[PDB]
Amino acid sequence: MAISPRDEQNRSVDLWFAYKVPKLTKDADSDSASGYEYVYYDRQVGAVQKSPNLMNDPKGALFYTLDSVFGDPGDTTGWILYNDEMPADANRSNNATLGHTKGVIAFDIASSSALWLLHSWPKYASPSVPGVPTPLYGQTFLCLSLDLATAGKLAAQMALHQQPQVYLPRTGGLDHTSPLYALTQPLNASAPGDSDSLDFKTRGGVPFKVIAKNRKWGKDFWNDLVGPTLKADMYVETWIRGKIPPVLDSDGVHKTYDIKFIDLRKLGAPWAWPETQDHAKWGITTTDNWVCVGDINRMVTQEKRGGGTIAFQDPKLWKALCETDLIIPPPGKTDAQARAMIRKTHEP
Amino acid sequence: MAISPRDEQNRSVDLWFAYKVPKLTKDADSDSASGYEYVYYDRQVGAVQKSPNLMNDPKGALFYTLDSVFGDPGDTTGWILYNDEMPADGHTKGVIAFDIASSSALWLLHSWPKYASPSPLYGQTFLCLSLDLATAGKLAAQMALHQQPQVYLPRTGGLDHTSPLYALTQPLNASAPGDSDSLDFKTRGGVPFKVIAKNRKWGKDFWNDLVGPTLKADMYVETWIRGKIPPVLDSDGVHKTYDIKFIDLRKLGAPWAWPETQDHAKWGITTTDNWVCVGDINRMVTQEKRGGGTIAFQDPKLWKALCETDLIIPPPGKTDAQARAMIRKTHEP
Numbered sequence: 001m002a003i004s005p006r007d008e009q010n011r012s013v014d015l016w017f018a019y020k021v022p023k024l025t026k027d028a029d030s031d032s033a034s035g036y037e038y039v040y041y042d043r044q045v046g047a048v049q050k051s052p053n054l055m056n057d058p059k060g061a062l063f064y065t066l067d068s069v070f071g072d073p074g075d076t077t078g079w080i081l082y083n084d085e086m087p088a089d090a091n092r093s094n095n096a097t098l099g100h101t102k103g104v105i106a107f108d109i110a111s112s113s114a115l116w117l118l119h120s121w122p123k124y125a126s127p128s129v130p131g132v133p134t135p136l137y138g139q140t141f142l143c144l145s146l147d148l149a150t151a152g153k154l155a156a157q158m159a160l161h162q163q164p165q166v167y168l169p170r171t172g173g174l175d176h177t178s179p180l181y182a183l184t185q186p187l188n189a190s191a192p193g194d195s196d197s198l199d200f201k202t203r204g205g206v207p208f209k210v211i212a213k214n215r216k217w218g219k220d221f222w223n224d225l226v227g228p229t230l231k232a233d234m235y236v237e238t239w240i241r242g243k244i245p246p247v248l249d250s251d252g253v254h255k256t257y258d259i260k261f262i263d264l265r266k267l268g269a270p271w272a273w274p275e276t277q278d279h280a281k282w283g284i285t286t287t288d289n290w291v292c293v294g295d296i297n298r299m300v301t302q303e304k305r306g307g308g309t310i311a312f313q314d315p316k317l318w319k320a321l322c323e324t325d326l327i328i329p330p331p332g333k334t335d336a337q338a339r340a341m342i343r344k345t346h347e348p
Numbered sequence: 349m350a351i352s353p354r355d356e357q358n359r360s361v362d363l364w365f366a367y368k369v370p371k372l373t374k375d376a377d378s379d380s381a382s383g384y385e386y387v388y389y390d391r392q393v394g395a396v397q398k399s400p401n402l403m404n405d406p407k408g409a410l411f412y413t414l415d416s417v418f419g420d421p422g423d424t425t426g427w428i429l430y431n432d433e434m435p436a437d438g439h440t441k442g443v444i445a446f447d448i449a450s451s452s453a454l455w456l457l458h459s460w461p462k463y464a465s466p467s468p469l470y471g472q473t474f475l476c477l478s479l480d481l482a483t484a485g486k487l488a489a490q491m492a493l494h495q496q497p498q499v500y501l502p503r504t505g506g507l508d509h510t511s512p513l514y515a516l517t518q519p520l521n522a523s524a525p526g527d528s529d530s531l532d533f534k535t536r537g538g539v540p541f542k543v544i545a546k547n548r549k550w551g552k553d554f555w556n557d558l559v560g561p562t563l564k565a566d567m568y569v570e571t572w573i574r575g576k577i578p579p580v581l582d583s584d585g586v587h588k589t590y591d592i593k594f595i596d597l598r599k600l601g602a603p604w605a606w607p608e609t610q611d612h613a614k615w616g617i618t619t620t621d622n623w624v625c626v627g628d629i630n631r632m633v634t635q636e637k638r639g640g641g642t643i644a645f646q647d648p649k650l651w652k653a654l655c656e657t658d659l660i661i662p663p664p665g666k667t668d669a670q671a672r673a674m675i676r677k678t679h680e681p
């Protein structure tokens with residue numbers, strides 16, 4: 001069958017999204033959340049809802065998607081794996097100058113089909129080691145159905161800008177002139193400028209943009225590249241973009257107060273957690289329903305490394321993500337004072 | 349004048365210790381602590397007390413000590429600035445300063461003079477010891493072999509190239525047999541201390557597998573944060589950072605207590621025999637492969653003050669025992 005994202009029932013789907021929760025504790029003897037629970041979204045369900053599965057189960061959209069690639073590949077099935085922190089079974093040291101971008105491009109040459117999985121797990125994925133990695137952080141996933149020509153145009157962009165660190169690839173007999181093949185070879189090309197944006201569509205016709213920075217980029221990825229590219233403002237007002245010092249409590253002791261929380265309780269996932277326990281590599285705009293899922297988090301301080309984000313319009317998913325904000329002030333402070341503390345992390 | 353630590357009143361002193369507080373917010377208008385306030389200790393005062401100074405003022409033991417070395421050095425005065433950054437292919441700083449004509453020296457842990465890194469966030473310890481030139485040389489020989497620090501802005505002061513202090517300014521190529529080393533020294537005032545070092549081969553627990561056994565006393569680690577506590581449930585599914593372990597100076601006249609995660613935590617004490625340790629290595633289980641070490645000395649007064657800085661605050665609905673179990677869970681690999 002044609003390479004495709006698989007949904008929660010192991011059926012082909014054009015696009016899916018997941019938001020995985022972090023590991024969340026009651027005490028030393030039990031957890032509220034293991035860190036493998038998640039909410040799931042695609043356009044056939046049409047709503048963001050808590051999944052009955054855990055991401056490390058041998059079921060659910062993540063497992064079914066990757067098992068349909070790694071499980072029993074045909075002779076023309078192949079994949080490009082990349083991560084700035086390679087998994088142990090690559091048995092290679094990391095090149096810190098390469099892109100800080102993570103994902104899987106899988107393809108089948110005979111059927112001219114492909115898929116792209118974006119994730120933010122270090123040391124993932126492996127084509128032969130089972131399971132999933134660290135459960136400690138909130139994380140987002142996006143999985144897109146592509147044709148082979150689109151996968152190749154994406155691979156051509158990555159060779160120049162994102163510059164992913166590729167490991168354990170399978171070529172599936174690719175012709176060596178393929179841009180997908182070139183992504184398995186050393187990346188040396190010089191890039192024009194410090195950023196690049198390209199328009200693509202899924203096989204099902206869903207438009208998306210891949211907005212990429214290269215190692216020469218030094219400005220604000222979100223406000224100076226993504227916003228301008230989308231012709232919209234990023235909704236950054238309540239972003240944690242730096243460290244907040246401890247604050248005084250009424251007992252005379254200073255404590256960590258998170259202030260900004262991410263809250264999935266309206267979506268059926270009965271948890272809320274500090275934004276500092278979240279990879280926070282997603283963002284939305286204030287208008288036009290853009291949802292961005294990618295490699296780059298919200299911190300002002302960034303390494304000069306390649307990477308990017310995927311942007312697409314989706315009113316349902318936009319509204320669900322918009323309403324996950326939760327602001328809790330430190331003791332004695334107002335909502336207004338709490339929001340000012342968050343904004344203070346946006347300055348140098 | 350011979351090289352010597354200087355106390356809060358710019359008098360020569362054999363040894364002094366300081367604990368600087370992190371920057372701590374009161375509200376949008378003011379900080380409870382700027383991050384330069386500190387408590388100070390030496391054996392002349394005989395108690396750990398809040399200083400009236402800010403550490404970055406041109407007053408107080410740290411400034412007076414540094415100014416006595418770098419402000420107007422004599423022709424045979426020299427120094428080695430070092431840190432534990434990895435060699436060439438956010439780090440612990442120190443200074444060894446010396447004067448050949450007077451055969452005098454001092455060792456300052458966790459600070460450099462301002463000009464070596466010009467312009468508060470975290471709690472930090474400081475220690476300064478009076479040494480003779482021979483002892484400073486034996487310390488430098490150990491560092492060339494084991495800790496292998498990176499060296500910055502040295503001044504040789506005419507040292508002979510055969511001196512181990514001079515050797516510390518030259519490329520460090522040694523590769524010792526064994527993974528660690530310990531040496532005994534004394535200050536000019538006669539206070540014994542040990543320097544306990546690991547080199548880059550060391551892969552075990554620095555504190556429990558090297559320092560403790562070397563001292564023949566267990567490190568007091570039971571309430572150490574040695575890793576990350578996940579967010580903990582408050583109510584209705586909202587999980588928050590509960591620090592659980594705090595460092596509390598309020599019994600010492602310094603009105604601040606803060607999370608141990610806002611502290612460099614490059615110090616420890618033993619459960620018996622009053623050992624105080626200040627060094628390069630923090631309390632985290634996860635450690636990079638690199639040389640480094642700690643000073644250890646006995647001090648009943650300083651030990652008790654540091655012991656009593658423990659503050660445990662359980663998350664809501666939890667007992668003290670449950671809180672301590674959550675702290676101990678961070679000790680797992």
Ligand SMILES: [Cu+2]
Nearest residue numbers: 084096100303
């Ligand atoms: Cu990196």
Ligand SMILES: [Cu+2]
Nearest residue numbers: 175176177185
């Ligand atoms: Cu070729």
Ligand SMILES: [Cu+2]
Nearest residue numbers: 507508509510
């Ligand atoms: Cu000679």
